[PDB]
Design a protein around this ligand. Structure first.
Ligand SMILES: [Ca+2]
Ligand SMILES: [Ca+2]
Ligand SMILES: [Ca+2]
Ligand SMILES: [Ca+2]
Ligand SMILES: [Mg+2]
Length: 184
């Protein structure tokens, strides 16, 4: 049943613009306690057949096949679910879902998006303490000096309500509320 819930949430999960992406992953990977995530750890271990810290394609396929236990058409439907997971949940594009990629996606967003976690992510990305996150600062998270215009446009359109080209904390929270459909 827990396995049903997490596979469900990985199904639903859709990609987002990069600031929201960097925020969720940072909160999920670094700001959560192992205590808070212990149920997700147990589920992850049930999927991780070879025990190496990451789910590959066969592991995810087996998770669905293990749940139902499967028609030739259910099989191709399962193939479709994993293809989706591997584009959306695999944030680093390495071909596996690491533990903390899995936790980020599968954790209750009401539980993840606490004001403390939001504000800690915020201040980590706002590296000069200016009170607003800029293009350069998003870029730093992805190892580059800036992000391209399309990337930044996507971010601004979602949350730059005052049209100043930067993301302040109030704007950051509203962005994350919309991405996760949650009131913070
Ligand atoms: Ca594995
Ligand atoms: Ca990955
Ligand atoms: Ca700043
Ligand atoms: Ca702004
Ligand atoms: Mg295992």
């Amino acid at each position: 049943h827990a396995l049903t819930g997490a596979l469900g949430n990985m199904k639903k999960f859709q990609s987002s613009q990069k600031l929201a992406q960097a925020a969720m992953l940072f909160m999920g990977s670094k700001l959560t306690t192992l205590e808070e995530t212990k149920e997700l750890t147990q589920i992850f271990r049930q999927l991780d057949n070879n025990g190496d810290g990451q789910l590959d394609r066969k592991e995810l396929i087996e998770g669905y096949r293990k749940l139902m236990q499967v028609s030739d058409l259910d099989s191709s439907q399962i193939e479709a679910e994993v293809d989706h997971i591997l584009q959306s949940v695999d944030f680093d594009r390495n071909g596996y879902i690491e533990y903390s990629e899995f936790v980020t996606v599968c954790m209750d967003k009401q539980l993840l998006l606490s004001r403390e976690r939001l504000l800690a992510a915020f201040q980590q990305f706002d590296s000069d303490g200016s009170g607003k996150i800029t293009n350069e600062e998003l870029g730093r998270l992805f190892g580059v000096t800036e992000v391209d215009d399309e990337t930044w446009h996507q971010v601004l359109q979602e949350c730059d309500k005052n049209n100043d080209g930067e993301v302040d904390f109030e704007e950051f929270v509203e962005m994350m509320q919309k991405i996760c459909d949650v009131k913070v």
